[PDB]
Amino acid sequence: KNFNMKPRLKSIFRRGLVKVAQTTGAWIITGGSHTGVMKQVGEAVRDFSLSSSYKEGELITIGVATWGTVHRREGLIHPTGSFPAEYIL
Amino acid sequence: MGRTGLRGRGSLSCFGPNHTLYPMVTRWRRNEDGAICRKSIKKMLEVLVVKLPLSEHWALPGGSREPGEMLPRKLKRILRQEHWPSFE
């Protein structure tokens, strides 16, 4: 579930979590979807990779979620095998 | 319910309780194929409210004892302008 904390904690946690994966070249295994703690980590990458949008230190956040809790299972299937396709949030 | 410091007015047109009703018409609402409220965890609701063009809010029929008639007929204080005399 979603949550809102003090913006000092936001300005510390969302800043430093970038500053981990910038220097080390890490992976960030997260929980997938758009709600909750997994939303707040997606804020931190957006707070970096479009403001200080640097190819140097491309952060890798791997989302592991449930094909079945996804909101649009349809529109994403292709027995063809490969697709540079789209969907709408 | 305690003194409100007022008069005895006939804004109610009645020196009393004026036992009224409100038909809370309730659509447990939808999306393309059936939805809930994802905002907290709960269920999202849809309600018909009528915006009267003069007073600046969006209301429901006040079943406030239509004069000469009963309480389900000032239910039709506005519901007579919803055109059906069939279903009662």
DSSP-assigned states of every residue in B10-39: SSSSSSS---------EEE--SSS-----S
- Chain centroid to Cα B16, Å, comes to 20
The CA-based dihedral angle spanning residues B49, B54, B57, B59, taken in that order and rounded to the nearest 10 degrees: -30
Q: Is B55 annotated as a binding residue?
A: yes
Contact A1 B40 (CB under 8 A): yes
Written as six digits, the tokens of A54 are: 């640097």
Q: Which residue has the tokens 């190819």?
A: A55
Contact A1 B41 (CB under 8 A): yes
CA distance A71 to A32: 12
Resolution (A): 3.6
Q: Looking at residue A84, what DSSP letter applies?
A: -
Q: Name beta bridge partners: B45.
A: B28
Determine how many CB atoms are found less than 10 A away from the CB of residue A58.
10
Instruction: Measure CA of the first residue to CA of the last residue in chain B; give whole Å.
Output: 34
Determine how many CB atoms are found less than 10 A away from the CB of residue A18.
18
Method: cryo-EM
Q: Which residues of A touch B40 (CB under 8 A)?
A: 1
Pairing state between β B50-51 and B26-28: unpaired
Determine how many CB atoms are found less than 10 A away from the CB of residue A62.
9
Q: Is B54 annotated as a binding residue?
A: yes
**Most A-contacting residue of B36, B38, B40 (CB-CB within 10 A), to test interface:** B38
Determine how many CB atoms are found less than 10 A away from the CB of residue A16.
11
Written as six digits, the tokens of B80 are: 């007579």
